[PDB]
Amino acid sequence: KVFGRCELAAAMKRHGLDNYRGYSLGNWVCAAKFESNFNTQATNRNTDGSTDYGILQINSRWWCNDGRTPGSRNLCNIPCSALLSSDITASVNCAKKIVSDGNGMNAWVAWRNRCKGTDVQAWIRGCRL
Ligand SMILES: [Cl-]
Ligand code: NA
Ligand code: NA
């Protein structure tokens, strides 16, 4: 599924991401835009052999099991394919564990390089939330 911007904002809010660990909703929408272009089916392979999955590009070395990342932890206890669903619940629940791990949203490279320090509220401007 490819979400619209406000559609994704509303889904993320319903799933408790607004201000989760202090990160306003716009941060999460911005991260999703630049991680996946709002596409739940996005995948990208990394140089170390891990793969990133879904709207928030969650990595198979630490967070989910894709059966082909040796020595990987499965800290969200989910198959990585569950992160590609049109229902973002599994991605959101795993993202909550990631953002609580110490480094906050700096875990998402695109957030650090393209959202951090910008006016992220623009990502939810105009939405009926
Ligand atoms: Cl980047
Ligand atoms: Na893909
Ligand atoms: Na992989």
Side-chain angles (χ1 to χ4, degrees), residues 34-35 108-114:
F34 293 122
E35 289 286 7
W108 284 277
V109 177
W111 179 82
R112 203 178 53 240
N113 290 329
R114 304 181 76 178

Side-chain angles (χ1 to χ4, degrees), residues 40-54:
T40 67
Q41 298 192 69
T43 58
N44 287 283
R45 193 97 190 241
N46 301 131
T47 56
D48 68 2
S50 65
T51 301
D52 297 334
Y53 293 88

